[PDB]
C-alpha cells in the first residue's frame, strides 16, 4: 500500500482519487491519501469550490516514485511533485499517519471496478500521450485539446492520442475505396493494431485512458477519441475473438461507472446505436448491450 501526502489544503476543494471523492474545507487539516493499491495507475483530481469549471488532476503510479500534493498560491492550484529524498518522504508519511490526518483509499474487497477500468492502462503509454518528460506523473484538465482537434494551438499542452480518421488515405487503400470504407478491418488490424499500437492491449489502454479523461474531467476530445476507437472495432467485419470478448467487458464497466446524469454529453447516440444494432459486431457485445438498454434506453 502506498501514500500520497498533502502539504496542506489552503482552499476549499473536492478531491477525487480514482472513482472516489471527498470534500475538503478551506484550511482543513487534510494531509493525504493512504492505502493506495499498488499495481495500477491512479488519478488524483480536483475541482475548486469556487470554480466548477476546470476539473484537473494527475495520473501516476506509486512504483515510479514518491509523489505528494502542494497548493501553489501563485498558479492557484494543487500541484503534484516528486520527493527524491526517500528518507525525508517516509518521515513525512509516518508522522501524518501517526496524527491520522489521512483518508484511506476506500476500496471494498469485492470490487474490481478500478482494475476493470484500467486493465490495459500503463503509465509509460500515458506519458507518450501527455508529453512532459521531466515529471513521472501526468497532468490533464477539462480544457486540454487533442492533436486531431488542433489540426482542424499550443502543442506542449496537447493530448497526443493516435489520430483515427475514417475518410483518410491511411484508412482507405487505393482501389478498395468502397470495401475499406464499409469494412474497416484493414484499417483496424493492419494499420492500427499491427502498424501503430503493435498489440490489442496498447489499443485498449488508450481507449480506457480516453474514457477516464472524459469521465473525470469532461475532456471533450477524449470523449471523441473513446468513441472513435469503439467505432473502428465495431465497423470491422474481422476482429480477433479475444478482442470482442474483452471489449464487451471493457465497455460494460465504463457504462456501469458513468454518472447517470452525464449520459447526455458523454454518450454519442449515433456511435452507440450503430455499434450495438447496425454494425458487424451488433451481436458481439451482449453484456454492454444489456446494461445500455436497462440504464439508458432513451439514448437508444
Amino acid at each position: 500500500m502506498n501514500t500520497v501526502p498533502f502539504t496542506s489544503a489552503p482552499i476549499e476543494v473536492t478531491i477525487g482519487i480514482d472513482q472516489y471523492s471527498f470534500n475538503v474545507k478551506e484550511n482543513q487539516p487534510f494531509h493525504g491519501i493512504k492505502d493506495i493499491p499498488i499495481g495500477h495507475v491512479h488519478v488524483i483530481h480536483f475541482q475548486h469550490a469556487d470554480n466548477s469549471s476546470m476539473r484537473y488532476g494527475y495520473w501516476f503510479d506509486c512504483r515510479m516514485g514518491n509523489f505528494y500534493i502542494q497548493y501553489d498560491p501563485k498558479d492557484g492550484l494543487y500541484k503534484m511533485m516528486e520527493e527524491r529524498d526517500g528518507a525525508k518522504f517516509e518521515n513525512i508519511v509516518h508522522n501524518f499517519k501517526e496524527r491520522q490526518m489521512m483518508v484511506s483509499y476506500p476500496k471494498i474487497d469485492e470490487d474490481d471496478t478500478w482494475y476493470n477500468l484500467t486493465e490495459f492502462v500503463q503509465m509509460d503509454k500515458i506519458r507518450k500521450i501527455v508529453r512532459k518528460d521531466e515529471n513521472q506523473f501526468s497532468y490533464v484538465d477539462s480544457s486540454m485539446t487533442t492533436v486531431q482537434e488542433n489540426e482542424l494551438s499550443d502543442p506542449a499542452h496537447s493530448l497526443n492520442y493516435t489520430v483515427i480518421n475514417f475518410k483518410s488515405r491511411e484508412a482507405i487503400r487505393p482501389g478498395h475505396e468502397m470495401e475499406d470504407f464499409l469494412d474497416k478491418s484493414y484499417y483496424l488490424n493492419t494499420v492500427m493494431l499491427q502498424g501503430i499500437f503493435k498489440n490489442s492491449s496498447n489499443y485498449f489502454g488508450e481507449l480506457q485512458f480516453a474514457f477516464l479523461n472524459a469521465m473525470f474531467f469532461g475532456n471533450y476530445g477524449s470523449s471523441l477519441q473513446w468513441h472513435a476507437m469503439i467505432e473502428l472495432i465495431c465497423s470491422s467485419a474481422t476482429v480477433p475473438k479475444h478482442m470482442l470478448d474483452k471489449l464487451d467487458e471493457i465497455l460494460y464497466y465504463q457504462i456501469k461507472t458513468l454518472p447517470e446524469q452525464y449520459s447526455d454529453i458523454l454518450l454519442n447516440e449515433r456511435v452507440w446505436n450503430i455499434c450495438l444494432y447496425s454494425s458487424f459486431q451488433k451481436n458481439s457485445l451482449h453484456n454492454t448491450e444489456k446494461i445500455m438498454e436497462n440504464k439508458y434506453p432513451e439514448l437508444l
Partner: protein
C-alpha cells in the same frame, strides 16, 4: 456548405464546378417470375455530370454488365458513380479540374469524398435545391445513346446547344431546369409542346429544337402553364 436559393448565382461564376446526379445510374424493370415471385431486370443507366456555366455534359453510360454477380446494387451504384466521377477528374488537365462538385443527392457525399481523397482541395457539396436532372432520360437523344450502348462509354454533349451564343448561363440553366421540370411532371405533354410544330427541327449536333428567341418565349410560358396545372391536379388546389 450546402447549395440553396440563397447562393444560387455562385453556379455562374468562373470557379469550375460540376453537378453530379446519380438517379439514373442503376435502373431496373420489375416483373413476375414463372413461379409468381418478383424479380428485377437491370437496364443501361448513366451518370449525369454537368458544368452549369458552360453546358458541358459528361454522360457516362453504365452498362448492365457492371452489375453482374454483385449484391446490394443500389449501394454499389453510389460507389460506382463516385469511382467514375473521380476517374473523370483524373482524366482532365489540372486547369480543367473542378474546384467544387455538387451532388444532387446527399447519399453520394461519403462515396465521392472517399473517392476524391487524392483531391483534398476539391470541395464536395450537397444541395437543398430540388433539381430535375432525373428527367435527363426524357431527352430523346440521351436516352437513345444510353439504351443502344454495348459497353461502358463516355459521351459528351452541350446540354445548352448553342443558347449561350445569345443568352447568359443563368438564363440557360433556368431554361434547362424548366424544360426538365416539365418533362418530369408530365413527360407526354412536355414532349408534345416541344415537337408539335414540325417546321422547327433539332440539329444533328443538338438536343433541343432550333427555336427563335420569340418561340422560346412561347415555349417557356407553355412549360410554366404545364407545371402549374399539374400542381393543382396533384394537390386539388
Amino acid at each position: 456548405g450546402a447549395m440553396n436559393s440563397s447562393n444560387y448565382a455562385e453556379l455562374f461564376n468562373n470557379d469550375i464546378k460540376l453537378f453530379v446526379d446519380d438517379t439514373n445510374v442503376y435502373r431496373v424493370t420489375v416483373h413476375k417470375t414463372f413461379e409468381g415471385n418478383v424479380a428485377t431486370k437491370a437496364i443501361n443507366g448513366c451518370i449525369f455530370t454537368l458544368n452549369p456555366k458552360t453546358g458541358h455534359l459528361f454522360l457516362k453510360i453504365i452498362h448492365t454488365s457492371v452489375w453482374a454477380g454483385q449484391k446490394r446494387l443500389s449501394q454499389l451504384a453510389k460507389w460506382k458513380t463516385a469511382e467514375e466521377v473521380s476517374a473523370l477528374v483524373r482524366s482532365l488537365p489540372k486547369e480543367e479540374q473542378p474546384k467544387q462538385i455538387i451532388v444532387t443527392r446527399k447519399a453520394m457525399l461519403d462515396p465521392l469524398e472517399v473517392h476524391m481523397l487524392d483531391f483534398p482541395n476539391i470541395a464536395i457539396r450537397p444541395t437543398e435545391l430540388r433539381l430535375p436532372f432525373s428527367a435527363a432520360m426524357s431527352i430523346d437523344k440521351l436516352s437513345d445513346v444510353v439504351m443502344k450502348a454495348t459497353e461502358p462509354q463516355m459521351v459528351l454533349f452541350n446540354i445548352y446547344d448553342d443558347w449561350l451564343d445569345r443568352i447568359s448561363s443563368y438564363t440557360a440553366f433556368s431554361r434547362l431546369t424548366l424544360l426538365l421540370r416539365a418533362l418530369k411532371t408530365n413527360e407526354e405533354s412536355a414532349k408534345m409542346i416541344l415537337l408539335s410544330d414540325p417546321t422547327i427541327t433539332i440539329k444533328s449536333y443538338h438536343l433541343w429544337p432550333s427555336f427563335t428567341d420569340e418561340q422560346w418565349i412561347t415555349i417557356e410560358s407553355q412549360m410554366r402553364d404545364l407545371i402549374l396545372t399539374e400542381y393543382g391536379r396533384k394537390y386539388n388546389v
